[PDB]
Enzyme design. Structure first.
Site, short mmCIF file in Angstrom:
data_model
loop_
_atom_site.label_atom_id
_atom_site.label_comp_id
_atom_site.label_asym_id
_atom_site.label_seq_id
_atom_site.Cartn_x
_atom_site.Cartn_y
_atom_site.Cartn_z
N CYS A 15 23.35 65.29 17.11
CA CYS A 15 24.37 64.36 17.53
C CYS A 15 24.09 63.26 18.56
O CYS A 15 24.93 62.38 18.79
CB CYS A 15 25.54 65.17 18.07
SG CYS A 15 26.49 65.77 16.72
N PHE A 72 33.27 68.66 12.21
CA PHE A 72 32.33 67.83 11.47
C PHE A 72 32.91 67.15 10.23
O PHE A 72 33.45 67.82 9.36
CB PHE A 72 31.11 68.65 11.00
CG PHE A 72 30.25 69.19 12.10
CD1 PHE A 72 30.00 68.46 13.23
CD2 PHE A 72 29.63 70.43 11.95
CE1 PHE A 72 29.18 68.96 14.21
CE2 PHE A 72 28.80 70.94 12.94
CZ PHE A 72 28.58 70.20 14.06
N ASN A 113 34.01 64.16 13.82
CA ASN A 113 32.66 64.02 14.37
C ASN A 113 31.62 63.94 13.24
O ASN A 113 31.27 64.95 12.58
CB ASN A 113 32.37 65.18 15.33
CG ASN A 113 30.95 65.25 15.78
OD1 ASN A 113 30.14 64.36 15.53
ND2 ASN A 113 30.61 66.35 16.45
N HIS A 118 29.66 59.53 22.31
CA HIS A 118 29.67 60.37 21.14
C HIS A 118 30.79 61.43 21.25
O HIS A 118 30.86 62.21 22.22
CB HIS A 118 28.32 61.07 20.91
CG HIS A 118 28.41 62.08 19.83
ND1 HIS A 118 28.56 61.71 18.50
CD2 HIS A 118 28.51 63.42 19.87
CE1 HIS A 118 28.69 62.80 17.77
NE2 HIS A 118 28.66 63.86 18.57
#
Lengths: 391, 392
Positions: free
Chosen positions: A166, A217, A338, A305
Site C-alpha cells: 500500500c 480492499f 482501499n 493513503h
C-alpha cells in the site's frame, strides 16, 4: 564522437526542470459492490450464510469502514466457477494467478489509455513504463503485457514493481521523478493496478483480522504521465514533484506482513498501525518541509493513503488538521474503498478536478505546496512533496 | 520561504554533476559447491529417478555441454531429504520453497553487501538508496527491508524492490541505479542481486526435457555494488562508469521465456530459438548504443554478456566475429558459478576488473576505454549498458 566531451554528453542527456504529472486516468472493474449490502452478499457467496454472529461482526466492520462502495473483478459468477477461492484457506493460488495475471494489465491499460488521451501525445513518445501491482506475479511481468496491449515501442524502458503493497503509490512517483528528471525528453507512463482476487477468501470466526481486508480492499487502476520540461502550449502539468523520502517507522516490526502462499495472499497486522503512523508522521513532515520554510500543516494540500478510516482520523487529530484537509482522500475511500497503490493517484485526480469545479486558484485546493503519503509493510511511509499548478 | 525562494536553484543543487560510477563490487555464494561432473548421478539420486536411465543420459549430455564446471546451492541433500515434494517433478511445494528463499535471499545478499561496503570503506550511514533484485520468492515487507534491517542501514534509505524479473535484471538494476545516483547529489546506492534456485529446483520428467535444462545451468549467488556520482577524490575508487542504457523486446520473441510462479513453485515455459533471436538482433542494439560514441568495431569494446548458456555466447561471437578472448571473463564466471540469473553480469564485472589488474592491463576493462554489458531474459528482453572503464 560524444566520447571527446562526456560532460557535454551528460548535460545533453539529462532534463532541465522538475518532473511533472502531465495526465492522470483511472479505471475500475465494472461491477460496483454496495457496502450496506456486502455482509449479506459475502457470507452467502462464501457459503457461510448461517454464521449469524460472525456475519454481524463483519457488518459492524463494514458500517465503520467509511466506504460506500467498491469495484470488484470478482463477480458472483466468477466465484461460482472458483469455489476454492470462496473457502477460508484452500489451495487456490493457481486459480488466483490465472485471474490477475490477465486482469491486472488489462485494467491498467484502461487507465493508461485515458491518461494518454488526456496527455494528447502519441504513445510512441512514451520512453519509460513503471508498472506497480501487489496482486499476482508473472514473467514477463505486467509491464510487458501493458506494453503489448498498448502497442508501445519495443524499446520502452520498463520498471516492474511487484508485491510492494500500500505505500507503492508513493514509490512509483519517487521512481518516476528520477527517471523523468535524469533523461531529457523522457515521458514516463506510470500504472498502478490492484485486483483483490488474490486476497479474497471466506470468513473464519477464529481469524477475524482476515475479515478486515474483506471489508476494506477494492479494485482499481490509475495511470499517470510524468515528464520534465513540458512543451509550452501543448502539454499541461497539474502537479510538480519537488522532493521524496521513504522511511521505516521505529518499533514497527511486523506491523503489516503479507505472504504469498498456496492459499493466495494473506495479510497480518501485529501492531497498532494508525497509532504508529500518527505518532511518527510529523517527523516526516519536518524532514520534508523545513527546507521549504513550511511548518503549518494546514497550509499544505494533503493526499494520504487511506488504509482505513482510523489512520485518517488519528493523523487528523494528532496534527490538528482542519477537517477539510483530508476531504479528497476520504471521498475516494468512500467511492472506491482501499485500492492499495492506485489510491493516492485517484485522490490526486479527485483533488485537481474538485479544485477546478470549486473555482480554486490551483490544482491543490488553492494552495501552492502539498504532501502525498503512502503507508504499508515495514512499517513503511513514502513521502512525496508536491507543487500545484495555477488554474 | 527557504528553498522556495528559488526552486530552479533547488533542482540544480538536488541533482548530481557527474556520471554514476561503480565504487565497489562484492559477491557471495552458498557454501555447498556442486561439481558438474558428478551432478547427473547426484541429481537423479536425490530426485529418486535412478530408474530413468535414458533420461539420465540426456541429462549427462546437458551437463557435459553446459560449459559449467562448478555451481553453488543453498539446497543440500539434507534439505532435500526434509522436503521430498521439492524433489518431485510437480508437487505442491511453493510454501516450503518460500520458507527457504524468503530468508536465504536477503541472507546471501547481506553477505555480498557487507563485502562491498567493506571495499568501498565508507560508513554504511552514507548509503542513501537500496535496490534489491531477485527472481526467487516474494514477501511483504520485501527482501530489501530485510537487507536494510540485517545491515543496520538508516531507516530512511530509499528502497527499490525488484521482484520476479529474471535473467536480464542485472542490467536493469544498473539502469535504475544510474538514474538514482545521477539525479541525487550525494546519493550512494547499494545494489543487490541475489538468486536462489530452491524456488525452481524440481525432479526430472522425460516428457519435459527443456525443463531439465535449467537443472543443468542455474546456480545460486548474490552480488552487491555501491553506485554513485561525484566520487570523493582519493577516498572513493571507481572501477566503471555508467554512460548509457537501453531496454528492448526482441522481434518475434513472444513466449520465448515465460516463468510462472505456481503452487508447484517457479516453472518455465520455453519457446523459440533464443540464441538465434539474440545473435540475430544484438548488432542493432550495439549500433543504437555506440554510434553516438563513434564506435563501430565490436572488438574494441570490453564485453560483459549474461551467460544464459554457452550457445548464446557462441552465436553472438560467431555473428559479430568477436575475437575468442572477448568473452573470456563471461565464460570464466559461467564455468565457475553457472548461470546465477540477475547476479551473473555483476560477477563478470568483478572478474573483468580483477583479471585486468592481475594481468597488468592499463584499464579495468582489459586495457580498453569503453565496454558493453548485456542482460538477457523474459520478453525476450535485452538490457544494454554502455560502460566506461577506469585507468589503472
Amino acid at each position: 564522437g560524444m566520447m571527446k566531451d562526456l560532460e557535454a554528453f551528460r548535460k545533453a542527456q539529462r532534463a532541465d526542470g522538475p518532473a511533472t504529472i502531465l495526465a492522470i486516468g483511472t479505471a475500475t472493474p465494472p461491477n460496483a459492490v454496495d457496502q450496506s449490502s456486502y455482509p449479506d452478499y459475502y457470507f452467502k457467496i462464501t457459503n457461510s450464510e448461517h454464521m449469524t454472529e460472525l456475519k454481524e461482526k463483519f457488518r459492524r466492520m463494514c458500517d465503520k469502514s467509511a466506504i460506500k462502495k467498491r469495484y470488484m473483478y470478482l463477480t458472483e459468477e466468477i466465484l461460482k466457477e472458483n469455489p476454492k477461492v470462496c473457502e477460508y484457506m484452500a489451495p487456490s493460488l493457481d486459480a488466483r494467478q490465472d485471474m490477475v495475471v490477465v486482469e491486472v494489465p488489462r485494467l491498467g491499460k484502461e487507465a493508461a489509455a485515458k491518461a494518454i488521451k488526456e496527455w494528447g501525445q502519441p504513445k510512441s513518445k512514451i520512453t519509460h513504463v513503471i508498472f506497480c501491482t501487489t496482486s499476482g506475479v508473472d514473467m514477463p511481468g505486467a509491464d510487458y503485457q501493458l506494453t503489448k496491449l498498448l502497442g508501445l515501442r519495443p524499446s520502452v524502458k520498463r520498471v516492474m514493481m511487484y508485491q510492494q503493497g500500500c505505500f507503492a503509490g508513493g514509490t512509483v512517483l519517487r521512481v518516476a521523478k528520477d527517471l523523468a528528471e535524469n533523461n531529457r525528453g523522457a515521458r514516463v507512463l506510470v500504472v498502478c493496478s490492484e485486483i483483490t482476487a488474490v486476497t479474497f477468501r471466506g470468513p473464519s470466526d477464529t481469524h477475524l483480522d482476515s475479515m478486515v481486508g474483506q471489508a476494506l480492499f477494492g479494485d482499481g487502476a490509475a495511470a499517470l504521465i510524468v515528464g520534465a520540461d513540458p512543451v509550452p502550449e501543448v502539454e499541461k502539468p497539474c502537479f510538480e514533484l519537488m522532493w521524496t523520502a521513504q522511511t521505516i517507522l521505529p518499533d514497527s516490526d511486523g506491523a503489516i506482513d503479507g505472504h504469498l502462499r498456496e492459499v493466495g495472499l494473506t495479510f497480518h497486522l501485529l501492531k497498532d498501525v494508525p497509532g504508529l503512523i500518527s505518532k511518527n508522521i510529523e517527523k516526516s513532515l519536518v524532514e520534508a518541509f523545513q527546507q521549504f520554510g513550511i511548518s503549518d500543516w494546514n497550509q499544505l494540500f494533503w493526499i494520504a493513503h487511506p488504509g482505513g478510516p482510523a489512520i485518517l482520523d488519528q493523523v487528523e487529530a494528532k496534527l490538528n488538521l482542519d477537517p477539510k484537509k483530508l476531504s479528497a482522500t476520504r471521498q475516494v475511500l468512500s467511492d472506491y474503498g482501499n485500492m492499495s497503490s492506485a489510491c493516492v493517484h485517484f485522490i490526486l485526480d479527485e483533488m485537481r478536478k474538485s479544485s477546478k469545479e470549486k473555482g480554486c486558484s490551483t490544482t491543490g485546493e488553492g494552495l501552492d505546496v502539498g504532501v502525498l503519503f503512502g503507508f504499508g509493510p515495514g512499517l513503511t511511509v513514502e513521502t512525496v512533496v508536491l507543487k500545484s499548478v495555477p488554474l
